[PDB]
Design a protein around this ligand. Sequence first.
Ligand SMILES: Nc1ncnc2c1ncn2[C@@H]1O[C@H](COP(=O)(O)OP(=O)(O)O)[C@@H](O)[C@H]1O
Ligand SMILES: Nc1ncnc2c1ncn2[C@@H]1O[C@H](COP(=O)(O)OP(=O)(O)O)[C@@H](O)[C@H]1O
Ligand SMILES: Cc1cn([C@H]2C[C@H](O)[C@@H](COP(=O)(O)O)O2)c(=O)[nH]c1=O
Ligand SMILES: Cc1cn([C@H]2C[C@H](O)[C@@H](COP(=O)(O)O)O2)c(=O)[nH]c1=O
Ligand SMILES: [Mg+2]
Ligand SMILES: [Mg+2]
Ligand SMILES: [Mg+2]
Ligand SMILES: [Mg+2]
Lengths: 225, 225
Amino acid sequence: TSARGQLILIEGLDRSGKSTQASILSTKLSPSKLIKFPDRSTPIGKLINEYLTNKSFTLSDQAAHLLFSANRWELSQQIQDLLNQGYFIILDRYIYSGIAYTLAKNDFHDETISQGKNKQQLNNIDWLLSPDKGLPKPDLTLFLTLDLEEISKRKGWGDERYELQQFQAKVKQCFLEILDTNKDPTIRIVDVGGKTIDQVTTQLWEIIETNKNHELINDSIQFIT
Amino acid sequence: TSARGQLILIEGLDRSGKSTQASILSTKLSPSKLIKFPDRSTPIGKLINEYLTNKSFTLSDQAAHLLFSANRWELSQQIQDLLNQGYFIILDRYIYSGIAYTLAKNDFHDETISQGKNKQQLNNIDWLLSPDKGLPKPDLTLFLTLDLEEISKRKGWGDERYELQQFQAKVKQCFLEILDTNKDPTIRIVDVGGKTIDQVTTQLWEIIETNKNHELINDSIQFIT
Ligand SMILES: Nc1ncnc2c1ncn2[C@@H]1O[C@H](COP(=O)(O)OP(=O)(O)O)[C@@H](O)[C@H]1O
Ligand SMILES: Nc1ncnc2c1ncn2[C@@H]1O[C@H](COP(=O)(O)OP(=O)(O)O)[C@@H](O)[C@H]1O
Ligand SMILES: Cc1cn([C@H]2C[C@H](O)[C@@H](COP(=O)(O)O)O2)c(=O)[nH]c1=O
Ligand SMILES: Cc1cn([C@H]2C[C@H](O)[C@@H](COP(=O)(O)O)O2)c(=O)[nH]c1=O
Ligand SMILES: [Mg+2]
Ligand SMILES: [Mg+2]
Ligand SMILES: [Mg+2]
Ligand SMILES: [Mg+2]
């Protein structure tokens, strides 16, 4: 069919290096757009931002999970169009963040993070995934993994709802549980413990340059199933 | 286990008689609560209300569909609790409205009603249903069916986004396609053409009184799957 750019997703915990490497990679990729999730500029995004930033605000975990997926569906069409025009697209967070942050509440009791004692559907990975099905699949997913101790040493803690170490630990496990690189070879878990900014960039670039994710291709856009 | 009230859902098109019969039935049922979907009082509800009432407002069909389901998940816990305390609950619209109004956009081209030429997932009944899975199943679902010509004669057209006869026709078909009373005997399609307010009430009541949906039961709450 025709030429297109590629979709490259960076996942990870807070302060794992995602926005830093996303910008650096927008620079190496050309032409390139950078999209952040959640997109707090959209109308659903502003709700999500209330939820994350005003910790008195009330919303069931299932409602919240659905808002995050709806927010991606606000951008889906635009993403496809840009890719098909030959743009390279860097995502900072996406469907893996969606599943993992919600999945982690399932055995976690903290009235701020997870409202109420019932955890209905919060361990059902298929329910959690189903609203993101049909969204564009990244051509490459890069998961940046790191020690909680190393994260605690960096600037960037912002007092949002999920920014609690005991919860972040559960989220770390949930991410490694849903990221299976044998069942899906588009996924690359990259250990960034004790690596500088440039060393990370060099590793990230090598993975990209080797699979040729920086070059146009004649494949169609894959979709999440 | 313990006693509970019952969940009785009234579905139908606009002006098919739903709010009228819901109030009348809150009166016959005791103790009773009436819940309307969408619930436009919640924070997601206010978004839904923007979407329905400000026809210049922009939102992808998939995002919109997800908001409607999220809105039900705002109320899910409360619904269960009230039922388990012995309250009878009347719903005016629910998951059937969710699927049908979105499913109907799939072969309908009108930039107000359905933004953009792609209809991704809008014919996939499983995607459409999946976010409502795990919500409480009504014990009885009553679908009020009626001619479009009879509807056009009644007061109640409010200029909201979907209030176009050519779309309403597609929605009517979608409802009859997803409501299968053989595969699910909790569902009752009731023809209300040429029936007065009281004649409808008498028919609705007979169905309820006969299945004993007005009485407490020792069954657990069923859930959508
Ligand atoms: N390899 C690294 N070593 C040390 N600090 C880093 C590294 N990468 C990023 N940082 C710094 O740590 C902080 C968090 O990085 P950031 O890229 O904002 O993470 P995220 O975008 O995942 O929340 C920033 O202050 C950033 O400069
Ligand atoms: N059986 C009926 N015959 C004639 N008019 C009716 C009947 N039931 C309701 N109405 C009237 O038609 C209008 C629409 O009814 P309503 O119950 O508001 O429908 P919905 O709640 O489904 O939008 C109201 O003005 C109402 O009084
Ligand atoms: C994209 C996304 C983020 N999140 C969480 C991760 C962060 O705590 C929060 C905001 O992310 P940010 O700090 O990277 O903007 O949202 C979800 O719970 N679900 C999602 O789908
Ligand atoms: C409950 C619900 C309503 N709808 C539509 C039907 C109506 O056009 C509109 C508002 O309903 P109302 O007029 O009964 O308040 O919302 C959906 O599209 N999805 C849903 O899930
Ligand atoms: Mg961050
Ligand atoms: Mg932070
Ligand atoms: Mg009405
Ligand atoms: Mg109306």
